[PDB]
Amino acid sequence: XAXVXAXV
Amino acid sequence: XAXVXAXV
DNA sequence: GCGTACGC
DNA sequence: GCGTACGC
Ligand SMILES: *C(=O)c1cnc2ccccc2n1
Ligand SMILES: *C(=O)c1cnc2ccccc2n1
Ligand SMILES: *C(=O)c1cnc2ccccc2n1
Ligand SMILES: *C(=O)c1cnc2ccccc2n1
Numbered sequence: 001x002a003x004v005x006a007x008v
Numbered sequence: 009x010a011x012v013x014a015x016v
Numbered sequence: 017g018c019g020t021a022c023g024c
Numbered sequence: 025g026c027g028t029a030c031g032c
């Protein structure tokens with residue numbers, strides 16, 4: 001759920 | 009030489 | 017429920 | 025000359 005590299 | 013994650 | 021970010 | 029960054 002976090003999006004720092006994927007954002008899901 | 010770039011440092012975005014290692015910086016060497 | 018998945019992976020992006022740079023060159024001295 | 026190497027790897028850091030977050031949870032809905
Ligand atoms: C987001 O909060 C989150 C948490 N754990 C995960 C595990 C695997 C893929 C995506 C995820 N996203
Ligand atoms: C993004 O691609 C990514 C990959 N791994 C991580 C680990 C911990 C925090 C954030 C991250 N983001
Ligand atoms: C920095 O400019 C730079 C370029 N290529 C590398 C290859 C391997 C380790 C570190 C590097 N740093
Ligand atoms: C830092 O850990 C890191 C790792 N791989 C990369 C690829 C491309 C640009 C920057 C990067 N930084």
Ligand SMILES: [Mg+2]
Pocket residue numbers: none
């Ligand atoms: Mg892509």
Ligand SMILES: [Mg+2]
Pocket residue numbers: none
């Ligand atoms: Mg460390």
